[PDB]
Symmetry: C3
Subunit: 340 residues, 3 copies
Amino acid sequence: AEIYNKDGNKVDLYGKAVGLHYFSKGNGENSYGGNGDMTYARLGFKGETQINSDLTGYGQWEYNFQGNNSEGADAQTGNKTRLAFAGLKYADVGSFDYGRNYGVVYDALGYTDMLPEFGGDTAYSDDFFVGRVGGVATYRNSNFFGLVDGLNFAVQYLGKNERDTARRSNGDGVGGSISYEYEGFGIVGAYGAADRTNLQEAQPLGNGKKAEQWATGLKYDANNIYLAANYGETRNATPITNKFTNTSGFANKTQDVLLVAQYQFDFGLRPSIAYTKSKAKDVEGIGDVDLVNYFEVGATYYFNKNMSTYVDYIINQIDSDNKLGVGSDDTVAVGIVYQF
Amino acid sequence: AEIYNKDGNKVDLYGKAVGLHYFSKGNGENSYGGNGDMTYARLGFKGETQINSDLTGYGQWEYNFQGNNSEGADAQTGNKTRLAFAGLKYADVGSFDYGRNYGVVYDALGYTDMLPEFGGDTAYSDDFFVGRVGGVATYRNSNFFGLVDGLNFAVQYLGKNERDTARRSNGDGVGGSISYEYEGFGIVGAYGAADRTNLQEAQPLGNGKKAEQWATGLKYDANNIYLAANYGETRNATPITNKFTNTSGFANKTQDVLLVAQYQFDFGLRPSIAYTKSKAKDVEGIGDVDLVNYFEVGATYYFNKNMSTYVDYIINQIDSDNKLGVGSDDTVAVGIVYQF
Amino acid sequence: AEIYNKDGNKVDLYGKAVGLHYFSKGNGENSYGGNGDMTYARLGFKGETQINSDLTGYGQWEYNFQGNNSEGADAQTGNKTRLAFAGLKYADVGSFDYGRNYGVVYDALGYTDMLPEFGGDTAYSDDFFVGRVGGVATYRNSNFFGLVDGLNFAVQYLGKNERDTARRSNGDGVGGSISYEYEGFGIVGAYGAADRTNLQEAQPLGNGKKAEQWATGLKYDANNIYLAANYGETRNATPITNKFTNTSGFANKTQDVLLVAQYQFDFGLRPSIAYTKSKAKDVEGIGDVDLVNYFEVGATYYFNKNMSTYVDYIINQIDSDNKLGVGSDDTVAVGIVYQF
């Protein structure tokens, strides 16, 4: 909600209260998303200032508060700053912003990440170029310097993040994306390469000094119709876990496919169907394994721009004898969303 | 303070900064409230959207930030999300919201929870139905479908919360309440029952598979006069600790009595007196023992709807040879509250 | 940014997004400020209500969110409530506020705490009277009861904080400050003394029952010119660490000197240079040793009151053979800041 607009500076204070519960069979240890309350809140601000007729400065912040914790010792469990950056936009030159913002490959992955609750399974947080990540400087250009309508591109530099855990770690990297839109159609390709930290190589699973992520996408977004497809490959880049041996790390190679089909009825209903297959190869001791594999059917009901409820049903295709101990049970989400 | 109201949606951004100090003799280890700085801040949003003439949507979030912590490792000690839910309200049919909201029995306990700082001692956080608690879907209905002015009631369903601590866990449960008000008078009855977790039974104190909490209240609230009385009973639900044996759990049976008397003077002062006695029975190894027992004297001075100060003196009736090692000393609070 | 003004209460919601990166050779520990991503965000409210034509009430809250953390287990590392207090201001009597607020000695140190990124090394967090501290009660008076323009003073009481770390602990104490300004010029003096906790004496470094901090400053702040000079001494108060022995504590005596020179060009540039030397004496086992010693050159370019960028280069004079293992390398900061 824009709550300040004066002297060439505007501040939108946005957020939401999302009441949410997951239902899966048994306890749901062996399920896709789990079982129980998943209620949460978002808060964030978008600030934008007009420095002059061509030049804009801006900054955005966003925090996820969890609401399924007690007021006890676990009060902070799952709270996080999701976004935190600042940047400039100048004429038809382009924009540059630095901080913790989504990685360049998500430019593609965003295409299919449209589901009521789930989906976009391959957009892991702090996972190099496929998701939200600290320490990125990104340059973007719209309509190619004002000469080509619909031609966007971006080059991203990834700063080194040597953390205590291997999962949230990354080396220095470079990435990019190119996208074209014309009359409802959209095509995007994105690729990133990065150094791996020593701490990541010292891990049981995954082998290489270089992580590589690339993805392409197609979409049709018009007349209440949304269709989307993502295909991607990763080299030493998808985080994975062996549930039997209790070891952690990355998959040597993965192939990811996402399909999304949604229709927006005028009366409030937006039924959604989807398909996801993320498969790994060369997982040490295990080899080839499916990390993600499901059909999804769901629907969001929009009361208006501020209120919605949805049901998101994940039909698991993963087999109970999954070599990586991946959950095989189905999971259902029921959400009611106030936002501003 | 309502800081956005446009296109049929309003957002009230409220919070407070409460400078607060506790005074007990010595270390205040052996007292009711403790000794030292207790400064805190609250921040939150109450959002409401008008969907159509009968149907309103809403969502609320609320956070407690502690200010008596350093900027070191304990910076987070006592910060927590208090409220986080979303819901719908339809005509004279009623309202429904899901998430973290006050438990149903609070509808009774709210009558006596009116003190400047302390009081309402039997409304423990994460204690099934008497205080703020995770995972509740609540139906409330005012004036009985619009057919009976003043007759409100509510039914609450409590989701299972298997946490790391027994204190902060709860099983599956259901509760309900009925209140009637007429020309200053108010009467309320409330009752809830719920399953207990394994981790809760594996505690030294308390025996049963079922938690039960009920409370009733009478009150007169008119012409600057506030009177309130609560009586309630609990079975295997009230959290307790043995300070000697260092053992934890719930009391098998408790009886709670709270009286509150306040008058609001027009020149700003609101002197308050209260009495609280919460005693337990069938406490393993001890039997009958008083958990809470004090008379309270205090006064709050309102500068305005945004500024106040108070002094709250707790005269403890608990004896120093309390079988559960409960504090016997008095505690005084000095508060200055800015709010919006 | 003022976002509410109705019925005699105003609420300014302020905060920022600071994209920031640190540059030092190698990993970062043997440097001044470190190496890698340091993006952070602030959020806060300043509230003020008019009770009547003479009496004003106010409250402020301010929080730091870190953005250089992952979304894993380290999500909260470096987040903190910086400010949390409430107070009153009455006519020409003066103002009084309680909570977690800046120490009184900061009234002096503020003259020099003006660099684009670093500087103000003697404004330690939770360090009695030289930095932000919980449980302080301050009375302040401007223009000496309104009779003498430019003559301001403050008296501050520091409440006891028996915490887990000697670094973040403090006993009961008293402090004060007096400042006078005339036609661009300013002079300020401040002094505070306090009891030390048992846990603080039980530390290896530092000897005494009374901690003492005092500091004076001169400044000229007019016609785009900013100059500042600060000199101070501490007794058993500056937190210090032996990097070789992994021992922590306080320096028995410190002498601190700070110089700051800045000029604000009308076209947007504000170059800043500084000098800071904080050296300790009678440090157990070592004796005399330098804690802080550098020359600084940097510049902030202001796009407007909402957007700015800076480069701040620290030239460390600290020796690689520092007896306390204090980093000896230089550090460069690069920042881009949106604020409101």
